[PDB]
């Protein structure tokens, strides 16, 4: 499929190198989430925002930031936006282990 | 009751002669009652249809209805004899039907009618095509869309070799002939798959 995407990119009016690299990243190579979250934490991110649809990443990331003292607040959601934009209501972050 | 000339004659007439056969007027068939706006700027009256993009250009003492089918245009020429003055239907000569139906056949089969559809030998039309079994998978992706319990068979369904052979069958239809008569040009638009 990578060469199919490359051929469609060349036939179209956009570049091929980024096309092949995105296709490889999204179709072929294995993604690792625990190490990505650890890199995010090592960057010092005290809060993380999930801009993806719904809150599947919210329930999928909480076990990974379970005891690191990193806060989570959903985005693209009514409750998440309410938590983000209201002074008197912010989500609670449990004590770091 | 707002235009004149051959354009009004073609627009008003409900019946036409399609190669020795009385059929409904194609301009009527597209949209019957006074749905064609007219323009008389440089004094060459023309009528167009909004929802289909049809046109009614006039080549002097002639009227042609042009229809955008898929990217391309089909042109049918109306011949107006003196009979049409009082109750005579417009005559669509056989060669105009040949041209229009050959363009439609090219649309249905290939790119253009002249020498792009496969040529016909003494009796037959032959083609040489490439075959890929994964095209069977991409065909059954759009064909087999039943419910949850069923699943497509592991073997290729027989309705897969019919794909590449369509241009040959359309060329054979185009070169088909009855007992002194060709069923390619009279009713290609009315053609349907029987069995």
């Amino acid at each position: 499929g990578i060469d199919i995407v490359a051929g469609w990119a060349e036939k179209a009016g956009l570049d091929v190198a980024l096309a092949r690299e995105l296709a490889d990243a999204i179709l072929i190579r294995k993604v690792d989430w625990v190490d990505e979250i650890t890199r995010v934490h090592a960057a010092g991110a005290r809060w993380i925002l999930d801009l993806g649809p719904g809150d599947i990443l919210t329930r999928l990331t909480a076990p990974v930031i379970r005891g690191l003292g990193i806060g989570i607040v959903p985005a693209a959601t009514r409750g998440g936006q309410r938590n983000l934009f209201t002074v008197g209501a912010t989500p609670e972050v449990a004590r770091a282990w | 009751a707002d235009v004149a000339g051959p354009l009004a004659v073609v627009l008003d007439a409900p019946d036409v002669r399609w190669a020795g056969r009385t059929v409904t007027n194609p301009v009527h068939r597209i949209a019957d009652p006074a749905e064609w706006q007219v323009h008389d700027g440089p004094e060459n009256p023309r009528a167009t249809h909004s929802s289909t993009g049809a046109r009614l250009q006039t080549h002097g003492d002639d009227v042609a209805l042009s229809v955008p089918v898929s990217g391309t245009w089909v042109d049918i020429r109306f011949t107006l004899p003196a009979n049409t003055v009082d109750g005579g239907t417009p005559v669509i000569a056989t060669e105009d039907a040949t041209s229009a139906m050959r363009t439609v056949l090219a649309i249905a089969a290939g790119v253009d009618s002249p020498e792009f559809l496969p040529a016909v030998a003494n009796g037959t039309a032959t083609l040489t095509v490439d075959w890929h079994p994964e095209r069977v998978a991409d065909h059954t992706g759009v064909t087999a869309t039943f419910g949850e319990p069923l699943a497509p068979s592991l073997t290729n369904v027989p309705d897969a070799l019919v794909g590449p052979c369509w241009p040959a069958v359309f060329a054979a239809i185009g070169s088909a002939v009855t007992d002194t008569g060709e069923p390619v040009v009279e009713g290609l638009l009315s053609l349907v798959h029987l069995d």
Binding site: - | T24, P26, R29, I30, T52, G53, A54, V67, P68, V69, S70, V104, I107, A108, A109, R135, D138, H139, T140, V142, T143, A144, F146, P149, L150, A151, P152, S153, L154, T155, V157, P158, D159, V162, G163, P164, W166, P167, F170, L189, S190, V192, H193
Partner: protein, 49 residues
């Protein structure tokens, strides 16, 4: 829409896809390919459970 079947199969007959050609052919609306029905019935008869 029957354009996907038209492109995968190979017959681009406008009566199945276009509206103007469907009106010209004498049909109110475009009709599905009959050979689509043939292939669907074949898959139904060869479906595995």
């Amino acid at each position: 829409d029957m354009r996907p079947f038209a492109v995968v199969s190979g017959d681009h007959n406008p009566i199945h896809t276009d509206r103007a050609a469907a009106l010209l052919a004498g049909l109110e609306s475009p009709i599905v390919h009959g050979m689509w029905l043939s292939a669907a019935a074949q898959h139904a008869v060869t479906a595995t459970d």
